[PDB]
Structures are given as structure tokens and as C-alpha cells.
Design a protein around this ligand. Structure first.
Ligand SMILES: CCCCCCO[C@@H]1O[C@H](CO)[C@H](O)C[C@H]1O[C@@H]1O[C@@H](C)[C@@H](O)[C@@H](O)[C@@H]1O
Ligand SMILES: CCCCCCO[C@@H]1O[C@H](CO)[C@H](O)C[C@H]1O[C@@H]1O[C@@H](C)[C@@H](O)[C@@H](O)[C@@H]1O
Ligand code: UDP
Ligand code: UDP
Ligand code: MN
Ligand code: MN
Lengths: 290, 291
């Protein structure tokens, strides 16, 4: 389908986008930073295919308190102008706040089991996402975006992230070397990566892609965790550790910069970030995990 | 996909770009393939596990059959070495194709085509010929089609780093220019028309490709645009190249190849920005060879 006439500044070949940071991976996937992309062209590209973006989010037990701010900020910054179908997974149906949604956007609530330990709740996300895409076949959406709930949107998060498979760089470890990365270092684990391996440390709280790729990934990670459980082992960073094992063995077709998941309290706002888009809501871990 | 094996390679650095001297990504987030931007180990893994097959089309019409020898022999050294390759030589002379020894898992087929008298028609009619070829045997034989001029020789690596849904190549004598200077078709009456305030890049008609579905889509559309022009009594300023540039403007390429992938050393030298010269023109006499 052909793009219409558009007027915009010309891509200048001998004038780099950004010079301080890496904008492309050695397997030729983009790293998304401000000033790398023209959202006008990308919006038009994705609007011509009438793209539908699913956004999954688990708000179990005390994490329902996070829903309102998460959902309202999503209205103002997440894939605006495009079709959005939210998926809210919770143990409490009544506790989901009434959030006014812009046109072409809807919400569905799906009840799940509540696990005792906070590690299991986070881990079993992979299982529940997989079981849901299996049950729906795909149908409704073209892409799925899977994020933590304890977050607020502050700036634009649009179709630039959309690609068959994507992860995001953990804000803690983008300037760290691979032996400083907190991979699972026990060879007994299905998530084991030795000190000589690894590209990036990816976040467990922001990944996604096409439905096919996301179903594939969540299933791989859950079965990987089931073998660990049977072997009596729990991965150091739980769901995150298995995603890292997976994105090492199956490279993402785009990678997102720490612009797309930050913590201003813990890490501030360094010069390499022109925009903070998706940010940690301050939480008392021990108390909110009960 | 296909699960990658354990590999040992230098770690990519987020705070340390490979190339600070060039644009390595388009405004629509397509990689621009320069030397330094990729690790061939990783890419060779990804594709080889797919059992990827590459089709290379090339036109040897009339006197341009003389170029085939050097073209094919240099391709065997540098083009897609280690992957399944099939050469498609389109000629009006089946007895003029030189006997070139191929590596394992590599094929060559000669297809007979007519020879239009004018060189412009020879060049422009490649789009129809590639498309009729694509339709004849759908995506029956290859996963990707690469479509290149013959007045050429490989001088360095040209591999699976080029493979994507749809790619184009930055013209060597324009990569530094500004869009108003690009020699697009400027007459509103032509289909290839692009006004002064549009355009991202000036692409080459002598090096493009992509997936079988995408290439056949491109060549067909280009041929149709040309038929409409010939009916209107107009021929685009730079022929198939012009129609291609219109097509890639309206359908952005998923990868862009840097001038590394088509250069003229006799005309333009070897600038510092080009670490390699992978695929270069063979100096020719334009009036005589085109006849
Ligand atoms: C020495 C560097 C410290 C950087 C902070 C690390 O954050 C934590 O990283 C581990 C992986 O090793 C895991 O992903 C949890 C993560 O902490 C969460 O996210 C950060 C950004 C903060 O918001 C924490 O409070 C969260 O619990
Ligand atoms: C101001 C730019 C000068 C660069 C040389 C122009 O080359 C010719 O450009 C036209 C369109 O503008 C078309 O692409 C043909 C092209 O000439 C061929 O390619 C170059 C690189 C040389 O190798 C020539 O000998 C070829 O005929
Ligand atoms: O009791 C819980 C514990 C976890 N989660 C979900 O699991 C994710 C991971 O937990 P958390 O955000 O605390 O991990 P962290 O950001 O600390 O790594 C949360 O975002 C929630 O979506 C939940 O809904 N209820
Ligand atoms: O008489 C001709 C004219 C052209 N060509 C083919 O069309 C391509 C483009 O023509 P040419 O190389 O002259 O264009 P240039 O590179 O000079 O712009 C050539 O590489 C050939 O493959 C051919 O085979 N015979
Ligand atoms: Mn979180
Ligand atoms: Mn040529």
C-alpha cells in the first residue's frame, strides 16, 4: 500500500542521527532513541495496515493500586491514534478502576490465580500470556506489548517500537559489560549464560512483538521455568532471566533504549536520555508484596 | 525462528557507536549497511539455519555478454559465499555465456530474452523480464531476489547482511547531495515524478532486491508505470532508475545499502567514508558497447 505525499526534513547521510549512543545492533536491528525516527512516516506506515496493538498488564493483589495511573497515562502517550486493546490480568475484578478511553480503544479484564510469593506472580506472567494467545488463536491484535504495572507513561511511546520481536535495555546495565550483567550463572539452570556470552541485559517489564513471536517467546520461557522447577532451581531474576536467555538465542528485530523503561528516583536523568517515556512508580517492595 | 548456538564475539557497546561518521539508520528505522555496523558471524548463523536461498538476476543483452566472465568469477569469490545461490543470466545469446566454475550448492540458469534495439529499452525492460520470470516460477526456487547490472565486478564481501524484505542502494555520486539536486523525474506528466521537496535518498537502478514477493511487486509496478508513460509519449530522464526511485519513496525499503555496494573507482576514487569497495563498475565506453 503506497504512502501519500509527505513533506519532512531530508535524511542527511553524512550527518549522523546520534553520535553518543549505538543506534543499530551488530545483527542489524535498530536501537530506538529520540532523533532516530520520524514518527510521521512510521504512523502513516502502520495506519495504512490498520495495525491493532494489544497491551498486557498484570495487576495482582496490592498491584491493582497501580492501574489507574498506568491506564490514564497510557491514554495520553501509548499508541495514540492507533487501535489499542488493553488486557488487564487480575485476581480482583471489582478493583479495576473506571478509566475513560479514547476512541478506537477498549479494555478487557481477565481473572487469574493469585500466587503467594511475589516471584511466582511475576514468573507465571509468561504462562498466562501464552494460555491467552492459545485460547484466542490471535485474531484481535497484530502486536502484543507486555509491561509491568508499577509504571506511568510520561512521553510518547508509539509504533516505532513495533517489530516482529523486541526487548528493552535494562537502565541499570546499559553501560555495564556482559560479566557485570546479572544473568543466571548456574549451569544447572535453563537460563544459564556464561561470562563470555550476551549482547544486552533486557528488561522483564517491557517486551513484545507480533502475536506469533510473543506466543512463541512466552511458551519457551514458561517451559524453561518448568524444567527449572522440576530440577529444584529458581532463576536469579525469575521471569527476566529466562527472557535474557531467549533474546540471546533469538535476537530481537528491534531493541529499545532505557528511554522506554526508567526509574528517575534511583537513576536520575542522564544526558543520553532526551525523553523519559515510561517510568517506575516508587514502591515499597516489601510492603506492596506483603 | 531457529535457536542460535553458543557464540563468542566482542560485546556491542551502547555508549560506543560503531560509526559516528555516517547515518546507520533511516528515519523509518531501516538499517543503512556500512562496514562496522554488523557482525557477519551472527548474520551467517541466522540465515544459514533458515536454509536461505538467494537468486541473483543479471542481464547480458547483446554486447554486454563480454562482462559476464569477470562478473560471475568475482561473484564466486565474494557473493553470498556459504549460502545456496542461483544465478539467473538473461541473454539474447545462449552461446555467449562463459563456462564458469561454481562452488558447491550454487547453480546457474540461462534464460533467453529478446534484445530491444535501444539501450534505454534494454535497461528499462528488465523490470518486465524479471517480473515475468518471477511469475513463471512463483517463489519456487529462491527466498530472495537480488537484481544487478552486469558491467560490474565484486572486489570484497557481499553477503546476507543485504537480505531483508526490500532493499535499495545509495547512488555513489549523490550520497552526499541534497534532495533538490537528485536527478529524479521532474515532469508532472510522468509517473516517476518527484517534486523538489520530496525524496529521502537517490537510489540505484543497478542494485536492488528483497524477498521474492516484494521484488516481483516492485518490478511489476515499475513496468506498469513505464507502459503508462510510453502511452503518454514520455520516457523518464533516467529510465528504470527513475521509476525505482518513485517506488522506494512511496514504499520505504527495509534495508538501505551504502555506496560500498555499488561504486565507480575511476570516476569517484576511494573516499575515507568507504572502508570497503565491495561491488564496482567495470569502466566502459558508453557509445560503442551500447551501439
Ligand atoms: C548496580 C546497578 C543497579 C541498578 C538497579 C537494578 O535494578 C534491578 O535489576 C535487577 C536485575 O539485576 C532486576 O531487574 C530488578 C531491578 O529493580 C527493579 O527495577 C529498578 C529500575 C527499580 O525500579 C527497582 O526498585 C525495581 O525493583
Ligand atoms: C552529480 C553526480 C555525478 C555522478 C555520476 C552520475 O552517474 C550517472 O547518474 C545517472 C543519474 O543521475 C544514472 O544513475 C547513470 C549514472 O552513470 C552510471 O553510474 C556511474 C556510477 C558511472 O559508473 C557511469 O559510468 C555509469 O554510466
Ligand atoms: O503481587 C504482585 C506481584 C507482581 N505482579 C506483577 O508482576 C510484575 C513484576 O513485579 P515488579 O514490578 O514488582 O518487579 P520489579 O519492577 O521490581 O522488577 C508487576 O509489574 C505486576 O504486573 C502483580 O501483579 N502482583
Ligand atoms: O546494450 C545493453 C544495454 C544494457 N544492458 C544491461 O542493462 C544494465 C544497465 O545498463 P548500463 O550499465 O549501461 O547503465 P549504467 O550502469 O551505465 O548506468 C547493464 O549492466 C546490462 O546488464 C545490456 O545488457 N545491454
Ligand atoms: Mn516493576
Ligand atoms: Mn551499469
Amino acid at each position: 500500500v503506497s504512502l501519500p505525499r509527505m513533506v519532512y526534513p531530508q535524511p542527511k547521510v553524512l550527518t549522523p542521527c546520534r553520535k553518543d549512543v549505538l543506534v543499530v545492533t551488530p545483527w542489524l536491528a535498530p536501537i530506538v532513541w529520540e532523533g532516530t525516527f520520524n514518527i510521521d512516516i512510521l504512523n502513516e506506515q502502520f495506519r495504512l495496515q490498520n495495525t491493532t496493538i494489544g497491551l498486557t498488564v498484570f495487576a495482582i493483589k496490592k498491584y491493582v493500586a497501580f492501574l489507574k495511573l498506568f491506564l490514564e497515562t497510557a491514554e495520553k502517550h501509548f499508541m495514540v491514534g492507533h487501535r489499542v486493546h488493553y488486557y488487564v490480568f487480575t485476581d480482583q475484578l471489582a478493583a479495576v478502576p473506571r478509566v475513560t478511553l479514547g476512541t478506537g480503544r477498549q479494555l478487557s479484564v481477565l481473572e487469574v490465580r493469585a500466587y503467594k510469593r511475589w516471584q511466582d506472580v511475576s514468573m507465571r506472567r509468561m504462562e498466562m500470556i501464552s494460555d491467552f494467545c492459545e485460547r484466542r488463536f490471535l485474531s484481535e491484535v497484530d502486536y502484543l506489548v507486555c509491561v509491568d504495572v508499577d509504571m506511568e507513561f510520561r512521553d510518547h511511546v508509539g509504533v516505532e517500537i513495533l517489530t516482529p520481536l523486541f526487548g528493552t535495555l535494562h537502565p541499570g546495565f546499559y553501560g555495564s559489560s556482559r560479566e557485570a550483567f546479572t544473568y543466571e550463572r548456574r549451569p544447572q539452570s535453563q537460563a544459564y549464560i556464561p561470562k563470555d556470552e550476551g549482547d544486552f541485559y533486557y528488561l522483564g517489564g517491557f517486551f513484545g512483538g507480533s502475536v506469533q513471536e510473543v506466543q512463541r517467546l512466552t511458551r519457551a520461557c514458561h517451559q524453561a521455568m518448568m524444567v527449572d522447577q522440576a530440577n529444584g532451581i529458581e532463576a536469579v531474576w525469575h521471569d527476566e532471566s529466562h527472557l535474557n536467555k531467549y533474546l540471546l538465542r533469538h535476537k530481537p528485530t528491534k531493541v529499545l533504549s532505557p528511554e522506554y523503561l526508567w526509574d528517575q528516583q534511583l537513576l536520575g536523568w542522564p544526558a543520553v536520555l532526551r525523553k523519559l517515556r515510561f517510568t517506575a512508580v516508587p514502591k515499597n517492595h516489601q510492603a506492596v508484596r506483603n
